[PDB]
Amino acid sequence: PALTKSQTDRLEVLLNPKDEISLNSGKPFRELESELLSRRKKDLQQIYAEERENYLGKLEREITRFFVDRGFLEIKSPILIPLEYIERMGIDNDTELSKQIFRVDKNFCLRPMLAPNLYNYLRKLDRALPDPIKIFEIGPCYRKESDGKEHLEEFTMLGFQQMGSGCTRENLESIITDFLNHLGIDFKIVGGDTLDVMHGDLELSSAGVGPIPLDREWGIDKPWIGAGFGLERLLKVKHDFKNIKRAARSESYYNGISTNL
Amino acid sequence: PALTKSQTDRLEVLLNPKDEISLNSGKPFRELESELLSRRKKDLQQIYAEERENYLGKLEREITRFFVDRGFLEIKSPILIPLEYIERMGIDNDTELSKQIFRVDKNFCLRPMLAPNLYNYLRKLDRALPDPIKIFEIGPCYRKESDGKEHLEEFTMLGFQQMGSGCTRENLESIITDFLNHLGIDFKIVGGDTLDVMHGDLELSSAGVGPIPLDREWGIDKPWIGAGFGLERLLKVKHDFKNIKRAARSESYYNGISTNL
Numbered sequence: 001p002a003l004t005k006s007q008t009d010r011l012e013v014l015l016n017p018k019d020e021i022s023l024n025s026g027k028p029f030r031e032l033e034s035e036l037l038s039r040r041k042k043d044l045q046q047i048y049a050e051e052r053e054n055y056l057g058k059l060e061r062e063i064t065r066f067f068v069d070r071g072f073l074e075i076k077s078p079i080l081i082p083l084e085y086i087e088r089m090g091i092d093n094d095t096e097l098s099k100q101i102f103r104v105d106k107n108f109c110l111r112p113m114l115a116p117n118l119y120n121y122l123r124k125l126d127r128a129l130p131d132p133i134k135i136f137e138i139g140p141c142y143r144k145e146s147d148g149k150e151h152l153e154e155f156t157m158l159g160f161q162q163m164g165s166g167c168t169r170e171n172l173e174s175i176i177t178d179f180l181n182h183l184g185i186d187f188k189i190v191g192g193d194t195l196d197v198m199h200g201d202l203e204l205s206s207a208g209v210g211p212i213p214l215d216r217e218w219g220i221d222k223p224w225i226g227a228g229f230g231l232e233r234l235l236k237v238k239h240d241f242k243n244i245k246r247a248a249r250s251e252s253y254y255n256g257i258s259t260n261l
Numbered sequence: 262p263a264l265t266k267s268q269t270d271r272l273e274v275l276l277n278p279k280d281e282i283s284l285n286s287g288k289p290f291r292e293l294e295s296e297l298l299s300r301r302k303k304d305l306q307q308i309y310a311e312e313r314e315n316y317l318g319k320l321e322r323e324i325t326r327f328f329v330d331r332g333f334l335e336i337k338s339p340i341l342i343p344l345e346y347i348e349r350m351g352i353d354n355d356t357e358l359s360k361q362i363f364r365v366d367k368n369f370c371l372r373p374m375l376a377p378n379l380y381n382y383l384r385k386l387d388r389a390l391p392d393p394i395k396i397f398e399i400g401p402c403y404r405k406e407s408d409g410k411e412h413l414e415e416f417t418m419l420g421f422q423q424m425g426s427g428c429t430r431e432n433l434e435s436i437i438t439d440f441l442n443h444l445g446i447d448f449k450i451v452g453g454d455t456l457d458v459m460h461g462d463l464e465l466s467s468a469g470v471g472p473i474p475l476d477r478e479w480g481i482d483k484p485w486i487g488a489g490f491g492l493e494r495l496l497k498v499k500h501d502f503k504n505i506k507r508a509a510r511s512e513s514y515y516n517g518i519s520t521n522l
């Protein structure tokens with residue numbers, strides 16, 4: 001009696017990437033399910049007995065320490081932002097992002113990105129802080145997305161930006177490289193300069209070197225370097241999850257372990 | 262020449278609670294403004310040179326360590342939640358909260374509270390973890406509010422909950438008391454049991470002891486204790502801010518310092 005596709009789907013919910021269990025073994029579904037249920041209950045018991053930390057929270061804290069220690073100021077800015085910030089980012093029809101916005105009320109949206117708020121902080125802090133100005137933010141961002149194993153509608157972005165002196169492509173690649181070697185994540189950098197940070201075919205980050213013409217709409221007139229990274233994609237690679245759902249804010253998975261036991 | 266109300270409003274933006282400057286001094290507005298601008302620029306320079314941490318992020322990390330160390334599992338659950346969770350919480354017309362919901366699309370809303378997701382986690386984790394089950398979450402919550410010095414529309418909630426053995430009012434008051442003495446925040450506890458944690462006339466928390474009849478709609482049939490705290494209200498008290506805007510996710514204040522310099 002071979003397993004049904006529905007049964008294999010159920011077992012795949014319970015399977016963790018380092019389990020060495022093969023589904024075709026010939027063992028009955030009920031037995032395979034009971035084995036995986038026992039393993040996942042034990043995984044949750046071990047977390048509860050020892051560390052008790054959530055992967056997404058813990059990763060945020062680790063990234064925060066890395067950037068604070070490298071001289072970047074920690075920002076916490078609004079998640080619910082004025083809708084006019086989207087248009088002011090140059091996002092209109094004929095851009096993909098235009099159709100992906102979660103609107104709230106008449107004049108607000110859930111931010112799909114961190115760039116508007118980081119631009120505003122760079123402009124304001126230039127009146128107080130010495131050159132160069134280095135800032136970062138980690139927090140929720142929102143985009144409407146087609147179903148896909150690499151995309152969430154509710155995700156978490158790291159964004160960092162430096163403005164003034166030292167804003168070279170070399171220095172940008174150095175930050176990225178030190179950061180991902182610190183986290184233990186393999187990558188390739190692929191390249192007004194623009195560049196993407198790839199893990200195989202998966203985009204971990206897009207990064208940039210300024211100035212660009214958009215800066216003037218935000219009151220920025222200095223060179224800059226910066227990048228944006230999705231935390232759930234970093235977790236997906238680090239823990240070898242097959243679907244990014246395992247890494248997201250979720251009621252269905254805790255540290256990549258099914259909560260439906 | 263006395264200061265105008267508009268001028269005093271501008272100086273109050275620049276005034277920090279421990280400044281020992283009196284507005285009626287007789288000094289001209291321009292001079293008082295220049296003094297406060299210099300002080301606030303220096304405050305930002307000192308943060309940037311030394312700690313570089315945001316108060317709201319740092320408070321979240323401190324609270325996280327307190328609860329993890331006391332045996333509570335750290336949860337990160339969705340901020341964008343099904344609208345049906347609101348009705349299932351018993352929130353209908355004739356309740357205040359009913360009119361305060363930020364709706365998104367047809368079937369979702371920004372969570373105004375943490376209770377639905379914590380109920381769901383308690384039910385699911387009861388199948389895996391030993392008694393008692395202790396969990397907590399910190400993160401963004403959203404409510405439409407009238408203008409007021411104690412309310413934000415975008416705020417941050419701590420919610421903790423224990424289920425099973427040990428769920429007594431005494432144990433609940435002990436958690437609260439240890440927590441606020443750890444943070445250095447003065448309070449009074451004022452009291453199916455219900456109780457509020459007050460700082461003067463300001464509500465820091467509402468807390469509760471179960472079971473209650475609502476539990477059955479969430480699949481819960483064990484005793485419980487729990488509470489919810491606003492982080493920005495804790496910061497407002499700790500730092501003696503006159504308006505909670507100083508403590509919120511914001512583009513206008515950084516660690517209670519005006520960014521408009």
Ligand SMILES: Nc1ncnc2c1ncn2[C@@H]1O[C@H](COP(=O)(O)OP(=O)(O)NP(=O)(O)O)[C@@H](O)[C@H]1O
Binds near residue numbers: 151152157206
């Ligand atoms: N829906 C999403 N879910 C998870 N992470 C995301 C999502 N959208 C963007 N990210 C992350 O945020 C980073 C910066 O955003 P951005 O450069 O705008 O993404 P993007 O170009 O739309 N990438 P993609 O949709 O994969 O082609 C990306 O490199 C991802 O790591």
Ligand SMILES: Nc1ncnc2c1ncn2[C@@H]1O[C@H](COP(=O)(O)OP(=O)(O)NP(=O)(O)O)[C@@H](O)[C@H]1O
Binds near residue numbers: 413465
């Ligand atoms: N709009 C808000 N801004 C900031 N903190 C809030 C807000 N609403 C609730 N809180 C915090 O969240 C805690 C738990 O929420 P809840 O008990 O529902 O609040 P509440 O009853 O509406 N309090 P209040 O509106 O002041 O009378 C409160 O005790 C506050 O510390």
Ligand SMILES: Cn1cc(C[C@H](N)C(=O)O)c2ccccc21
Binds near residue numbers: 225
């Ligand atoms: C600061 N920052 C953030 C991003 C990612 C995305 N565009 C966002 O705004 O969140 C980014 C990309 C290139 C250069 C700088 C960047």
Ligand SMILES: Cn1cc(C[C@H](N)C(=O)O)c2ccccc21
Binds near residue numbers: 420487490
């Ligand atoms: C777990 N928890 C959370 C709250 C506050 C608010 N009602 C919310 O849901 O976020 C709360 C109040 C009493 C008892 C337990 C509580």
Ligand SMILES: [Mg+2]
């Ligand atoms: Mg995209």
Ligand SMILES: [Mg+2]
Binds near residue numbers: 203205206
């Ligand atoms: Mg990209």
Ligand SMILES: [Mg+2]
């Ligand atoms: Mg209220």
Ligand SMILES: [Mg+2]
Binds near residue numbers: 464466467
């Ligand atoms: Mg209350």
